[PDB]
Amino acid sequence: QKLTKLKALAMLSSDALSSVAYGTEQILIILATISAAAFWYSIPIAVGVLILLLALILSYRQIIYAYPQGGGAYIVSKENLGEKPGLIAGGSLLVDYILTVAVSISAGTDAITSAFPALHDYHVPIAIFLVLVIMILNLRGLASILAYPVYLFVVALLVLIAVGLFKLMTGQGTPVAGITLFLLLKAFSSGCSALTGVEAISNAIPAFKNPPARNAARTLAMMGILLAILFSGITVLAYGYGTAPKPDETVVSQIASETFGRNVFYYVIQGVTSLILVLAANTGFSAFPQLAFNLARDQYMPRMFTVRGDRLGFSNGIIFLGFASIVLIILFGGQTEHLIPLYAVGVFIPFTLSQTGMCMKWIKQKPKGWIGKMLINSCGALISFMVLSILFVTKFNVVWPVLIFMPIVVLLFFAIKNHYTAVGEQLRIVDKEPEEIKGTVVIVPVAGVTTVVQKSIHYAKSLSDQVIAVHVSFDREQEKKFEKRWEELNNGVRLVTLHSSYRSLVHPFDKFLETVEAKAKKEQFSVMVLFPQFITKKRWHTILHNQSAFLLRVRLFWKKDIMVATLPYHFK
Amino acid sequence: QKLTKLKALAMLSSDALSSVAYGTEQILIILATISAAAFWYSIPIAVGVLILLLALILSYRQIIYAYPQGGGAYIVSKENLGEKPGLIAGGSLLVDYILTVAVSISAGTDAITSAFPALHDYHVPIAIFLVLVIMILNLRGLASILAYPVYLFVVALLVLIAVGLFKLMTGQGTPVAGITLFLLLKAFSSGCSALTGVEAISNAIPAFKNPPARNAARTLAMMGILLAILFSGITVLAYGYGTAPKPDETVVSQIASETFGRNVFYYVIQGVTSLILVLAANTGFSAFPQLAFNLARDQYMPRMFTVRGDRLGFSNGIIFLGFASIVLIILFGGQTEHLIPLYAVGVFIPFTLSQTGMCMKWIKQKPKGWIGKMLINSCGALISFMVLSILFVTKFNVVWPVLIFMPIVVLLFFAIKNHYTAVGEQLRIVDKEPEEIKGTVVIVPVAGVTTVVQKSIHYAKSLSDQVIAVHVSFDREQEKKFEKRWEELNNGVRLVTLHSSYRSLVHPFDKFLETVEAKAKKEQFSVMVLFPQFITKKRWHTILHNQSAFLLRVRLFWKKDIMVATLPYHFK
């Protein structure tokens, strides 16, 4: 259960070092708006990205040591920056998860269509299909499938880089007009979408070896080095071959095809890239609940997320995350180019907030060597904020959804916090002992003389006396037959048959319950209803059974403050 | 509650006579594939459609008399053709409802964009938005809004027809190569999508005046005459002005603009058409549950639909119908042209089955004048089957989804029927009285000393003795504080504190429940758990509260055959 360095790197790096499939492509797409001759500018810009990457790693190398409990960006932003910055970081992490699912799936389908161009008319269905698949694979459960594909991806891309560099060596500057500083910055910001998951390792510190902090930091350093090597090699290869971004083929696919030649090696590369992107999406799915629990300990998210041991909130979280990702995929049509700016925003707001909190914490404490750590975090935060500002300013026509999504989730967090605050305020205070109860009348609603009915009557009689059976009859003809059949049973239970012409079920019970509750209140008795819970071993018969019980519970019995037992009954 | 003829026509005709907005358009679109000079062929084809319409009306004029209880196509296909034809009719009616929602909404948005061309880039969002709106308006409840717009539509289109005919009179043959018989039949089949809701009146016979059959038949005849007049007038006007189908404007919009001139009259026409199409979609929504109940009486659909008086199944039905319609809208991009063939298939399978059943019933009985009724139904069935065959053969690339949807729903119906058959078989048989119970031990899970906890303890003590409180503690530190606070309460209840390191909640309860259940079984006691049901008056705090209770119920207590009371507690 204590992952070693290699296995931990495999399980947690599938999000970060899987972004090399669409980073250099973004850089080249932005540069191509001027001319194909500007592609050499990818070489410096890429270097700048690595510089940023270095800062991030160093910054997070601090965070892991400062917060060995885990937490990550949310905790750092909460403790050191207050409550609103922490909530903003949480919302941005939610956007990060939704967008990493969407972007990873879209890029995977782009890789697949590059492998088989005949599916270019099904970019969106395939994508959505894949999403649903992993949703199921997360509802069903779910460890080897998350560890080998990353090794395969790293090995395959290292082989591809080596072969491409060898071919370039065997042969198998220049300023260009139009490139202004602003467009260079735009390209750099778009290319910073290669640093889209270095967060993950800092969020899973406990699942490490005996020293958790040291092992996590060394794993993060190794992952950073691997990502830097892969990204630099891919960018160098792309510059070497030219490889302008085609509208129906990824840059990696073009590089592989011009290197190996659409043979088994190329298909291996494409399949492995698709697999690693799917694993990245699954990483987003699996990383959401950790954030949910971290928020829920502070009463910002439902208490149902605080039970982490039983995966209480995993179903709702997985369903909501999958549906949000599907909605985003449909909205942008699976265009990885049009989705990446939003993903970068959702990733870089937490980066900025986390580095700012780190810097202010260092300022507050001022330990030995505080100046260097402060400088590193400050530089990282400045660069990240610049990238975020550029992404807002330029690609607003695809970043508009975050400007709507952030206020909604922040307000939801505040509303939940206020609600739990009020509830905890007025519930903790204890009070006087309630009115005495001298007995209990049990009402058993019956839909027909069955085995389940007789079992429930038996338990009701065991529980207390005064048991009365109640039957709402939709037709006056079957009243006599049902009453006779009940009399055939030798139960000493008074049966009250009451009629409803309009096939309604609540209102006749409303009247009867009024009468019975008044009568019981005269004798200080507590009315109580005993429903059977028919259970079958199919998990899809739930809609087929005992729904009238839920109707009566929800619409009548909760409003009347009446105990409602639910005796289960299994089916063979 | 007993609708008069006029009000009934208004409430039920919003589906049938709202199809004039896209029938002549389909005829013209099919004819335009040859040349604009072939548009005169719309005049004969339209006439043929009316002939078909006449048959349908006559056929249904019989059905209303033969089945005054209602039912409609499903009952006719069930009694006279067997079980599988009845199920096929039911599935096709489900497709009819989904497609009428989708098509009506799409045509409404087409009318809106014709009114304001600036929204042509939002055909699908607007559409989906409208759908969601009516979904809400069907979950909230929902009678005058369903009665006046139909009157407005009829009046407005009658005015438009009169004005257009007047202008044609004041002036304000010719065989064409390429028109083969097959293409004429294709155009006729596509134009038969004007008869897309004459079914509705036959499905709501009881809600009429003192003679239900006569009043329903006369209302159906009046609606048929109105539809014939509107459709014929629209087709004549379209032929008179030429009005080739533009890619960004409905034929009705073109007719109105060339008649009135984009003034307040034209905007009134467009708005009224949009309103009538929205009402048609709402008619589909409201008509689904009648089919659901009719199926459920025969154990083909969940029993939860048999309680028609309390609208038990309306929530699930509305949600599923809305989501299916939204999926179809997105799939075909709100192209009313591409959706109509599927709608016509889903409407005409029931027409064919119903007329065939009517004919065979007449053959079996052979009453006076049987020959004429048999001939009418036979002719209607033959024409409908021909139209359906043509729609399958030609427009397969948009009718493929029904070929997938039909087997799934038919198999679901059969599976549900088999399941209820087995359950009813093995449940009715009564058996020996179960083991005696000599008392009851009550387990009260507590999450902290609160008012709710003390109320639940009070009720548990009232219910029986041997009450024991149980607390799972996620941290050993707060164990002592919680135990001391419990001791501060003077409850004579033994508190068992048990610890779970991984924040799990089921497993410690699993062990404790094993021990307690064994101990109680030694004394023939029945274990029982008492949960509080925290209730707030906001309907959206449901996710915020008492979810651990649902976790414990679902994952632990149903599997152990243990009674689980649920005492409600209201919030102030």
Ligand SMILES: Nc1ncnc2c1ncn2[C@@H]1O[C@@H]2COP(=O)(O)O[C@H]3[C@@H](O)[C@H](n4cnc5c(N)ncnc54)O[C@@H]3COP(=O)(O)O[C@H]2[C@H]1O
């Ligand atoms: N003959 C049969 N064929 C198929 N399934 C059968 C069946 N008899 C019982 N069941 C299954 O058992 C569930 C509970 O049956 P019971 O009548 O004990 O429990 C009923 C009864 O306690 C009460 N209830 C239902 N209809 C009622 C009525 N018309 N009048 C009074 N109480 C009614 O609500 C509970 C829920 O009933 P619901 O029908 O939702 O759920 C039923 C159904 O799922």
Ligand SMILES: Nc1ncnc2c1ncn2[C@@H]1O[C@@H]2COP(=O)(O)O[C@H]3[C@@H](O)[C@H](n4cnc5c(N)ncnc54)O[C@@H]3COP(=O)(O)O[C@H]2[C@H]1O
């Ligand atoms: N201080 C507070 N702040 C905000 N809301 C509060 C609150 N105290 C109680 N509530 C509300 O009351 C519900 C039931 O509280 P109770 O502890 O009686 O009912 C609990 C208790 O009977 C049992 N349970 C929950 N956690 C437990 C634990 N750690 N150990 C043992 N039983 C537990 O499951 C029931 C469901 O509890 P859940 O927390 O889902 O739902 C809670 C929550 O919605």
Ligand SMILES: CCCCCCCCCCCCO[C@@H]1O[C@H](CO)[C@@H](O[C@H]2O[C@H](CO)[C@@H](O)[C@H](O)[C@H]2O)[C@H](O)[C@H]1O
């Ligand atoms: C809950 C309320 C909050 C807001 C409501 C929810 C959103 C409402 C409208 C959203 C959709 C409107 O916008 C609709 O979708 C996208 C917008 O990105 C457009 O489509 C375009 O999206 C982006 C833009 O380059 C591309 O990736 C895509 O290929 C392109 O087709 C559609 O042509 C437009 O019709």
Ligand SMILES: CCCCCCCCCCCCO[C@@H]1O[C@H](CO)[C@@H](O[C@H]2O[C@H](CO)[C@@H](O)[C@H](O)[C@H]2O)[C@H](O)[C@H]1O
């Ligand atoms: C059971 C698992 C299998 C999955 C089942 C679900 C199937 C998919 C559900 C609906 C998918 C909708 O797919 C929708 O199709 C429309 C056309 O109708 C596509 O159509 C559009 O695609 C993009 C823009 O978005 C353009 O390149 C293309 O020219 C345009 O036609 C949209 O890209 C997609 O949003």
Ligand SMILES: CCCCCCCCCCCCO[C@@H]1O[C@H](CO)[C@@H](O[C@H]2O[C@H](CO)[C@@H](O)[C@H](O)[C@H]2O)[C@H](O)[C@H]1O
């Ligand atoms: C509660 C508040 C609600 C929030 C806002 C509600 C709706 C907001 C959705 C905004 C629409 C998205 O904006 C979307 O942008 C893309 C380009 O990026 C447009 O895409 C379009 O560009 C041009 C210019 O219109 C079109 O001619 C072309 O057909 C298409 O590619 C979509 O037509 C537009 O819909």
Ligand SMILES: CCCCCCCCCCCCO[C@@H]1O[C@H](CO)[C@@H](O[C@H]2O[C@H](CO)[C@@H](O)[C@H](O)[C@H]2O)[C@H](O)[C@H]1O
């Ligand atoms: C339990 C599920 C069982 C399997 C379900 C059946 C599988 C269905 C596969 C869905 C494939 C999606 O199909 C996708 O949309 C339609 C099919 O109508 C095709 O294209 C169609 O819609 C497009 C896009 O709106 C329109 O231009 C036009 O109406 C038509 O060409 C798309 O080119 C195809 O990409």
Ligand SMILES: CCCCCCCCCCCCO[C@@H]1O[C@H](CO)[C@@H](O[C@H]2O[C@H](CO)[C@@H](O)[C@H](O)[C@H]2O)[C@H](O)[C@H]1O
């Ligand atoms: C709160 C109520 C408001 C509704 C909120 C929901 C907003 C809508 C959710 C996503 C809608 C998706 O809208 C999707 O946009 C894509 C482009 O991205 C559209 O794009 C496509 O439209 C059709 C083909 O389908 C072509 O005419 C168009 O050229 C093409 O771009 C698809 O038609 C539509 O399937």
Ligand SMILES: CCCCCCCCCCCCO[C@@H]1O[C@H](CO)[C@@H](O[C@H]2O[C@H](CO)[C@@H](O)[C@H](O)[C@H]2O)[C@H](O)[C@H]1O
């Ligand atoms: C159980 C699994 C069920 C089978 C799974 C697949 C179900 C059927 C989906 C495949 C057919 C999709 O439906 C079909 O999509 C193709 C591909 O866009 C569309 O094809 C049309 O548009 C595309 C896109 O421009 C053109 O390339 C093509 O030449 C043209 O014919 C058809 O108009 C649509 O009818």
Ligand SMILES: CCCCCCCCCCCCO[C@@H]1O[C@H](CO)[C@@H](O[C@H]2O[C@H](CO)[C@@H](O)[C@H](O)[C@H]2O)[C@H](O)[C@H]1O
């Ligand atoms: C337009 C497309 C046409 C409509 C789509 C196709 C409709 C028909 C396809 C479904 C046919 C189902 O075929 C049905 O399968 C169910 C599954 O248990 C079984 O149905 C059988 O159920 C049990 C025995 O098991 C018998 O009580 C019942 O009388 C019998 O019908 C039989 O195998 C067959 O009756």
Ligand SMILES: [K+]
């Ligand atoms: K990534």
Ligand SMILES: [K+]
């Ligand atoms: K219609």
